[PDB]
RNA sequence: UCGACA
DNA sequence: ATGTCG
Ligand code: VO4
């Protein structure tokens with residue numbers, strides 16, 4: 228299987244886990260940053276990966292784009308497929324912002340239709356995903 | 364008992 | 370190290 232360059236790549240970035248979470252989506256071909264989330268004080272890697280895909284889904288749908296989305300997160304891909312984020316992050320006053328975004332993301336998935344293929348970025352064959360933050 | 368993706 | 374799934 229080859230890389231579908233005509234696509235959107237998303238990825239999470241964090242400082243600690245759980246810790247500060249952010250994410251962005253980029254054009255897989257050029258690397259142009261199409262959107263980037265404002266750092267979230269506290270959240271998990273998988274929540275961020277999940278929010279990144281849903282944000283890409285809405286980004287593409289508003290523009291009537293049928294391009295697929297690449298993510299390197301097996302967990303986030305499954306959560307999106309089930310339209311349910313199974314995070315273990317403790318629900319409390321500290322993790323309110325991330326959980327709210329996560330709940331709203333889920334809500335969006337349960338209130339909208341889309342055919343966007345959500346593809347697994349084969350990191351071991353193609354190297355780091357184009358929207359990556361972390362060290363290689 | 365791990366294996367895997369982050 | 371910690372977050373999650375097969
Ligand atoms: O802009 V919306 O996709 O929330 O309908």
Ligand SMILES: [Mg+2]
Nearest residue numbers: 238239299300
């Ligand atoms: Mg990732």
Ligand SMILES: [Mg+2]
Nearest residue numbers: 238359360361
């Ligand atoms: Mg990354």
